DNA sequence: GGTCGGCGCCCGAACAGGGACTG
DNA sequence: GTCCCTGTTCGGGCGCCG
Ligand SMILES: C#C[C@]1(COP(=O)(O)OP(=O)(O)OP(=O)(O)O)O[C@@H](n2ccc3c(N)nc(Cl)nc32)C[C@@H]1O
Ligand SMILES: [Mg+2]
């Protein structure tokens with residue numbers, strides 16, 4: 001098969017990211033997979049004259065002694081849409097990375113796919129390989145496998161025009177309004193289709209509005225917290241007014257003193273309860289800008305998010321509620337969170353969002369791979385937030 | 396011999412050209428050994444004589460070896476290195492004896508003149524020109540940037556058949572140093588060892604018997620490995636009476652290196668003595684606490700200590716224990732009072748922090764280091780109350796976590812030193828605080844008003860808006876009683892104080908912490924600034940006087 | 945004395961990010 | 968924007984190994 005020439009963006013050198021400590025089982029699975037991938041000619045050992053490196057690890061999927069190798073290609077991906085899919089009852093995600101392995105990679109570009117397997121207690125220098133085929137996890141892999149995949153899926157689509165088949169990185173999203181069961185059987189028909197060449201519910205995705213407390217008594221303190229939350233929200237909803245509630249405070253009251261809600265105050269508050277129901281105005285998705293996702297920990301396995309692009313122009317605001325046990329793993333919850341949110345952002349826009357994680361960076365990187373399950377890795381950065389925004393999206 | 400292994404292709408940086416540095420003044424004994432080397436290497440094909448078609452030169456020199464009898468022929472390629480292409484280093488860290496499994500039979504051995512047994516790339520050999528008081532390298536020179544990485548890559552390529560056909564002999568491979576373990580009887584062991592020396596020879600790699608250790612205690616990587624214990628080779632501390640920045644550095648380095656088997660080492664005070672300096676030579680007076688820290692470390696180092704080896708059958712355990720001033724010591728064992736290794740964590744991450752954040756940071760450090768050495772995570776023994784941890788990761792807005800652990804009553808115990816109420820206190824005086832400061836003059840004010848009529852305004856000089864905000868909080872803490880409600884409009888201060896710190900680089904915040912520990916109920920509330928909400932409004936008119944508008 | 949690479953620690957310099965401020 | 972404060976990274980010195 002002929003090879004497509006590929007080049008980096010101008011004035012960018014390839015990636016030079018150090019490989020981070022793997023665990024014994026992750027290393028052993030990586031080495032098994034890698035020796036068989038060398039036996040099959042997909043990868044070739046390389047030396048230290050290649051100065052490019054991208055990290056590598058591996059994941060275990062649920063209840064199957066199969067491991068999956070993950071290359072962290074986002075640094076390289078940097079250097080290189082079916083809007084009805086959000087509307088299907090059932091949506092299955094299929095892994096189809098193996099397919100890329102059947103197409104060669106531009107030789108000029110293989111030195112950029114370079115990666116190093118580590119070894120326990122450094123028994124051994126890093127063992128380095130580069131890719132001969134298209135790699136699982138790279139931006140260009142589906143780009144090039146384009147025409148091949150439109151061919152492969154022509155007959156299945158023509159046969160089932162009410163189905164949606166989206167592709168992003170190593171994943172294929174198949175969505176249909178079929179019954180559960182008929183849906184699954186159609187999916188098995190698609191798997192049998194793919195094996196001739198060689199579970200989500202978007203209907204039930206809800207936005208979480210900002211909501212105001214309902215009380216019978218109001219204290220100086222409750223009203224200051226209300227006015228603060230409204231003052232902030234006015235930056236999203238300009239219809240928010242706080243005149244009357246404010247004027248009720250006027251003067252140097254003790255936090256615990258109770259204030260009674262004047263008629264104008266109670267009406268301003270009910271009108272502001274309304275205004276927070278109308279959706280946000282003037283928020284259009286820009287494909288040429290990055291999606292940004294902020295995640296707040298509200299405690300009790302409660303995690304709120306907003307996806308936006310321009311500040312205050314929230315494309316979506318959501319929440320993610322898990323087990324409130326005494327054995328809650330906050331990191332585990334966070335990664336599960338960011339994976340769910342990345343799925344939403346892909347299904348809705350076909351783009352991954354850059355995350356603003358509430359976590360010490362070291363804490364994140366130590367564990368976050370222990371709980372990953374998806375074939376892509378979204379960008380992220382770490383924040384040191386005030387619980388102001390935290391207090392605003394509370395419930 | 397010269398390995399018939401293919402030479403790693405090496406180029407230079409675009410638009411660069413070889414070194415043209417000329418020899419420096421050289422003692423003879425060095426030149427005598429230089430020529431005695433150079434000529435035997437020329438005999439062996441390791442350096443080849445060049446003429447004037449080669450415009451390049453680089454300084455050479457020599458040093459004694461660990462032997463101290465022989466000589467290391469070093470070249471000074473600062474310029475060539477600056478101009479050679481970039482590599483990807485393959486040495487990813489140092490092996491640690493505490494990640495050695497118990498083997499029935501062991502050998503350590505070292506390779507005969509190793510760099511000089513591996514072929515440089517021909518098209519590059521020219522920039523390796525030198526003149527002894529004119530040759531070029533046909534092998535790997537010492538002092539060149541690419542020689543480590545290249546050697547190590549290569550040595551791995553070579554050993555790869557042996558490891559493939561002998562997957563049950565473990566070969567720890569640092570530079571040319573090889574530790575070899577097997578579960579065979581000593582007889583069959585030495586058989587497999589001779590088989591490996593034969594393999595290395597086949598690739599042109601001699602294992603001089605002079606460095607072929609057959610009996611314990613195997614000297615390896617700075618340790619002595621006995622069959623069931625290991626220990627670090629003896630450590631000697633600098634015992635000056637006037638210390639300088641460099642005397643200090645080497646002292647802390649010896650200490651840090653010790654801390655890996657000597658539990659309890661402490662370096663924060665000494666290290667703090669290094670703050671602000673300029674040159675290596677600045678002599679500096681030991682403070683009484685640095686002096687005493689040194690005393691107790693010295694006291695520690697006199698005792699005997701040894702690690703054991705790693706059993707994968709047993710669990711890994713890390714226990715952590717607290718010293719002062721954000722210092723922490725941990726011990727990783729598998730079986731009580733049988734240290735696999737020890738350590739210490741002291742890093743100060745944050746302007747403000749508390750013992751609980753530091754403990755978690757320590758846990759992360761140990762987890763990453765355990766993964767490196769043994770590939771798995773230890774179970775923990777930690778001096779923090781299951782309740783203190785539940786409360787903490789309850790209220791704290793950041794994701795945070797600690798793998799499987801258990802409490803151990805080993806004072807000092809870790810606790811949060813105070814707590815902020817969730818709801819405002821009935822009967823507690825309510826302080827509306829604020830500060831403001833002028834950007835040109837650096838003049839400001841900070842103060843409060845209270846629902847009970849009191850109001851105070853303090854002037855400050857050479858201050859900052861944030862500083863004034865903290866000053867007003869501090870004031871309010873100073874003048875209130877054992878219960879007080881505080882309302883500030885400075886999410887910076889709120890953000891510090893909710894975090895529940897107990898140490899701060901800032902003195903203001905330390906005074907603030909002292910106050911917060913003294914009280915019995917504090918409630919700290921926020922309101923948006925400059926929005927006419929009493930009595931934020933009154934205090935803001937109070938401090939904005941003379942310093943704003 | 946004077947070279948190289950890796951890792952550790954520790955410090956300081958140079959960044960990036962975000963909140964409060966002036967007329 | 969400027970100023971202020973927090974965080975991260977990167978490079979400098981020492982240590983340790985070859
Ligand atoms: C591989 C390897 C070796 C092994 O050491 P060795 O101390 O065993 O020396 P050797 O070459 O093996 O000779 P022998 O063992 O017969 O005495 O490490 C390297 N080495 C060591 C010190 C040293 C330095 N001060 N600067 C530089 Cl840039 N490289 C250095 C090169 C040497 O080849
Ligand atoms: Mg040697």
Ligand SMILES: [Mg+2]
Nearest residue numbers: 829830884924
């Ligand atoms: Mg203010």
